A paper describes a structure:
The fungal Bromodomain and Extra‐Terminal (BET) protein [name] is a potential antifungal target against invasive fungal infections. One attractive target is the fungal BET protein [name], a global transcriptional regulator. We show that [name] is essential in C. glabrata, and that inactivation of both [name] BDs induces lethality.
While these compounds potently inhibited human Brd4 BD1 and BD2 (IC50 values of ≈10–100 nM), consistent with previous reports, they inhibited CgBdf1 BDs more weakly (IC50 values between 0.5 and >100 µM; i.e., a 10‐ to 1000‐fold reduction in sensitivity) and failed to inhibit C. glabrata growth in vitro. These results demonstrate that small molecules can strongly discriminate between human BET and CgBdf1 BDs. To rationalize these data, we determined the crystal structure of the highest affinity CgBD/BETi complex, CgBD2 bound to I‐[name]. CgBD2 undergoes a minor conformational change to accommodate IBET‐151: in unbound CgBD2, the side chain of “YPF‐shelf” residue Tyr327 adopts a gauche minus (g−) conformation, stabilized by a sulfur‐π interaction with residue Met395, whereas, in the complex, Tyr327 adopts the trans conformation to avoid a steric clash with I‐[name], thereby widening the ligand binding pocket. The shorter side chains (Cys340, Val392) and altered conformation (Glu331) of three CgBD2 residues further widen the binding pocket and reduce the number of hydrophobic contacts with I‐[name]. Consistent with this observation, the Brd4 BD1 pocket buries more of the ligand's solvent‐accessible surface area (SASA) compared to CgBD2 (55.4% vs. 47.2%).
Author numbering: 301 to 416
The structure:
């Protein structure tokens, strides 16, 4: 499982993506999509690997991420799911783009090398 420096970097990115500073557009991505409560019963027709920021946060703190690439895959899945179910021009599509660009910016400074 991921080492200390890489884990603390990942915690910082995930904490930043979930911060209340960004609550006006990260809120739909804090918890898993509930198609029954949200009245979109065809969500799982389009999304086969659901993911949310809270799930990524728990997997990280649960020592489930072997490396930073695995975390990037999961976080990318949040937005791939969003754009797959929500067409261009919808609110949550715009919010997903806003949050994903923040993620790309923070992730650009990820450690590239490991040193046990
Ligand atoms: C309108 O889309 C959502 C709205 C949500 C949501 C998750 C989604 C969502 C996500 C994320 N991916 O697909 C869907 C559908 N999760 C919680 C939540 N609480 C909540 O009030 N909403 C409403 C309906 C909403 C509508 C448009 C933009 C932002 N939020 C939502």
């Amino acid at each position: 499982a991921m080492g200390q420096r890489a884990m603390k970097f990942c915690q910082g990115v995930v904490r930043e993506l979930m911060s209340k500073k960004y609550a006006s557009f990260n809120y739909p991505f804090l918890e898993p999509v509930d198609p029954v409560a949200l009245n979109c019963p065809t969500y799982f027709d389009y999304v086969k690997e659901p993911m949310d920021l809270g799930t990524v946060s728990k997997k990280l703190s649960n020592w489930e991420y072997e490396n930073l690439d695995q975390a990037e895959h999961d976080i990318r899945l949040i937005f791939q799911n969003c754009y797959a179910f929500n067409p261009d021009g919808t609110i949550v599509n715009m919010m997903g783009h806003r949050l994903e660009d923040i993620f790309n910016t923070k992730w650009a400074d990820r450690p590239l090398y490991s040193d046990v």
